[PDB]
Every structure is written in C-alpha cells, then in structure tokens.
Amino acid sequence: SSHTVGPMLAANAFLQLLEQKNLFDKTQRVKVELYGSLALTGKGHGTDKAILNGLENKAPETVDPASMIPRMHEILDSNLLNLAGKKEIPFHEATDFLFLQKELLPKHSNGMRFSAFDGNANLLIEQVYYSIGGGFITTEEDFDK
C-alpha cells in the first residue's frame, strides 16, 4: 500500500531531479521499469496509476484519488504524458512502462528505475528508487547511507 504512495513520491522526486540537472527541457520521452514486488503487483493494481499521475506532479496528499484512474486512461488513450504538468510528451505503455516480474534490483524488492530520453533517442539520465516502510522513498545511492 506503499505500492501507491511511495511510487508517486519516487516519480515526484524524479521530476525535481530533471529540474535540478537542467534536463527537463531536453526531455522528450520517459521510461519506467518496476521490479520485484512492485512489478509483481501488476498492471492495473495501483502502481502504474500512482506513478503516471506522480510524473504529472500529482502528489499523494495534494491529489484527488477518484481522478487517478480516469487520468491514467486519458494518458494511455491520448498517448500524451503531461510531464511535471508543464510539457506534453509522447507516451507508449508497451515501451515506457515495464513490469519486470522476473527481475530484482539488488538493495530491496520494491525497486524502480526512471529514465529520460531526448528526441534523438539519447538517454539523459537514469535514476533508481526504492519505496520502503509506510512508503518513504530512497535513491539507490542513498540507500545505504
């Protein structure tokens, strides 16, 4: 149930990373990859809804929950994601939201990787997050500190 809250925050964090690193403007495609139990608790079971809305800068106290499923549907239907609420970018689930049930990130089971790409298909940045406890968030590299 920190399969909803945590992933929403992770997305949110990734959005700020894009600003912090001045790669938001250059970003034309985004990819999300879920692992271990996050991946296992599948398509339609909260986490995708949570992540997409969060990538749109909805955030989990701020946001309205009745709106989350409709909004996911619009995103898939239109193939447009409103990154951080500022920019509409192409989105294709087959390609941009993966459930890797057979795979495990090494720190913990509830793992995620966020990736941004520019319009010439170059990777701009990659960031791994984990959600643990009630649904607090941590980066790969802060996990152990």
Question: Is residue 59 at the binding interface for a copy of itself, with CB under 8 A as the rule?
Answer: no
Binding site for Mg ion (CB under 5 A): 77, 79
- Return left, alpha or beta for 134; rule: phi > 0 is left, psi -120 to 50 is alpha, else beta: alpha
* Residues 6+ away with beta carbon under 8 Å from 15: 54, 55, 57, 83, 84
* Residues 6+ away with beta carbon under 8 Å from 51: 7, 8, 10, 11, 32, 97, 112
Nearest distance from C-beta of residue 123 to a copy of itself, angstroms: 7
Question: Is residue 29 at the binding interface for a copy of itself, with CB under 8 A as the rule?
Answer: yes
Partner whose footprint covers residue 66, from a copy of itself, Mg ion, none (CB < 5 to 8 Å by kind): none
Nearest distance from C-beta of residue 102 to a copy of itself, angstroms: 6
Given 6, 7, 36, 46, the residue binding a copy of itself (CB under 8 A): 36
Q: Which amino acid is at 52?
A: L
Question: Is residue 126 at the binding interface for a copy of itself, with CB under 8 A as the rule?
Answer: no
Question: Binding site, residues?
Answer: 76-77, 79
